[PDB]
């Protein structure tokens, strides 16, 4: 019992981060196989965040321009090249370390970790969602560009996210392992509207699935609802509509509990219509969006 | 800027677990050099549970009915010894993957990341406080027991948590790394009185200041306090008397924002007897406490 924020263990993640150096610029990089993964801002100076020409700062450096370290040992960079927005440092060696993985390009309102890192060396670990505006809210200072979200499943790590920079507003913006980002964004230092953002609906309610396994039970009424009256509600307080997609992905957790998730939602438009009357739910006073159904079968199962 | 809930990077605990069976019981257990460290009810049946003479169970048992595996490779054991409510298994190699170690003892009030195994392999992270009445409210189900709780000092572990047990209530009792229980808890299935708990006021302190730092001021306010006044509402709110080592420790915090302790004081004592209006304080709906001051200049400075 008990039900916690609970982020991937970080040690095969660990094991791949570098510090990538160009000039005067030091971030971290991403170490799999034989290749370092970067944001391409590495090389620009404060005067060309304004407004950099990716193409013509990287025609400035060579292989040797690009000091990569991991930990205490030097690596020979004898390649670059620029894929969207990060750059790949091809190595002369492969990385001991390197675990089984993956690159993936999450969907929003999915969960993932993060490895926060700062010269290469990783500093904390935690859980977070992808909001619907592909905006994450993280936990970055200067220096965090590089450090990456990922899941795991048993053995193979998942690598979706690489933290490029915090919007005027605080919020996040990266990209995935191939340089896209997530959202509108592009790599200047311009202000840059992340757009409306709603309420992972799906997520809330396997949260609230995860309370009732918990002991966590207050909040269930003696109401039902519809989807289409549901969604009049979650319209009403931004919240992400609910489809027929997501009521299947509830389906375990619906079946473990007896609870239909048409009588769950009822429970979370009363709780969006009266609000929580100062009390909590799994230690929280708002409702949760950032555990998806997945992660809440996950962790009341204890899967490793 | 960004405020998390961040546990430290668990790749060096990672290479530390183990499996640990005895009879038709499996659990968690910690390999430091060449001793392996779990929770002395391993050696018990579902019967035993209830009351358990432990001393006697354990003259029952021989080196060689400890199965230790480290993920695929099996442990010789080659001595036992059970220190209070931990079992010591002497193996006959050192842990490859032993970090910079240490055992100590927490305070009540401080905070350290947990890492969530079962069957000697690790599910999650996340980081959680001592409760003031020494439970923590953690995430734990049957097989989780030997999981541990640690801080990172650059390359130093301290392990001051090892997990044993959930109480009827649903949160969770442990020991430190010799096997005492934090606070009266036995080893055995009996209801036990946790006793009053309280919130962590230097904390909630240290928060608020985080909150200052990332732009979440509107609960700061035209008011001050002093340590007697602030401490008659503490009191009434169920919350630690603030002392002065307490207001010490705030120094830092108080010294970067310019804003003086019992100004901070005034503003928890405002929202403690108001509320927070519907409003949020870094993304959380009620006064949290699970940030040590320490923890916040940590994440506020991005220390690795
Ligand atoms: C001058 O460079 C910066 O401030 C970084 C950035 O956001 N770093 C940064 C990242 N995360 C948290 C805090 C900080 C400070 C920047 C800005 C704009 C565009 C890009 Cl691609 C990069
Ligand atoms: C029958 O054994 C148990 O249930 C464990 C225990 O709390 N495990 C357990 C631990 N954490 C979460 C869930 C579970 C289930 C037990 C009970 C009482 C005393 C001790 Cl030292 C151990």
Request: aromatic fraction near 12%.
């Given at each position: 019992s008990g039900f916690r924020k609970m982020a991937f263990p970080s040690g095969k993640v660990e094991g791949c981060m570098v510090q990538v150096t160009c000039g005067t610029t030091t971030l971290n990089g991403l170490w799999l196989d034989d290749v370092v993964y970067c944001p391409?801002?590495?090389?620009?100076t404060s005067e060309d965040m304004?407004?950099?020409?990716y193409e013509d700062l990287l025609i400035?450096?060579?292989?040797?321009?690009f000091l990569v370290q991991a930990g205490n040992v030097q690596l020979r960079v004898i390649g670059h090249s620029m894929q969207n927005c990060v750059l790949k440092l091809k190595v002369?060696?492969?990385?001991?370390?390197?675990?089984k993985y993956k690159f993936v390009r999450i969907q929003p309102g999915q969960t993932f970790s993060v490895l926060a890192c700062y010269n290469g060396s990783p500093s904390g670990v935690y859980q977070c969602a992808m909001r619907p505006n592909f905006t994450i809210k993280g936990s970055f200072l200067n220096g965090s560009c590089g450090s990456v979200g990922f899941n795991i499943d048993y053995d193979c790590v998942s690598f979706c996210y690489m933290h490029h920079m915090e919007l005027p507003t605080g919020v996040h913006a990266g990209t995935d392992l191939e340089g896209?980002?997530?959202?509108?964004?592009?790599?200047?230092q311009t202000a840059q509207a992340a757009g409306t953002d709603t309420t992972i609906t799906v997520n809330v309610l396997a949260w609230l699935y995860a309370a009732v396994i918990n002991?966590?039970?207050?909040?269930?009424?003696?109401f039902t609802t519809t989807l289409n009256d549901f969604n009049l509600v979650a319209m009403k307080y931004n919240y992400e509509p609910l489809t027929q997609d997501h009521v299947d992905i509830l389906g375990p957790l619906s079946a473990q509990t007896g609870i239909a998730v048409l009588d769950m939602c009822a429970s979370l438009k009363e709780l969006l219509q009266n609000g929580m009357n100062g009390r909590t739910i799994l230690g929280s006073a708002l409702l949760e969006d950032e555990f998806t159904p997945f992660d809440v079968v996950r962790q009341c199962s204890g899967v490793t």
């Open positions: 391409r801002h590495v090389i620009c304004l407004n950099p020409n400035r450096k060579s292989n040797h321009n002369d060696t492969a990385n001991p370390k390197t675990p896209n980002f997530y959202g509108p964004f592009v790599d200047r002991g966590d039970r207050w909040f269930l009424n003696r």
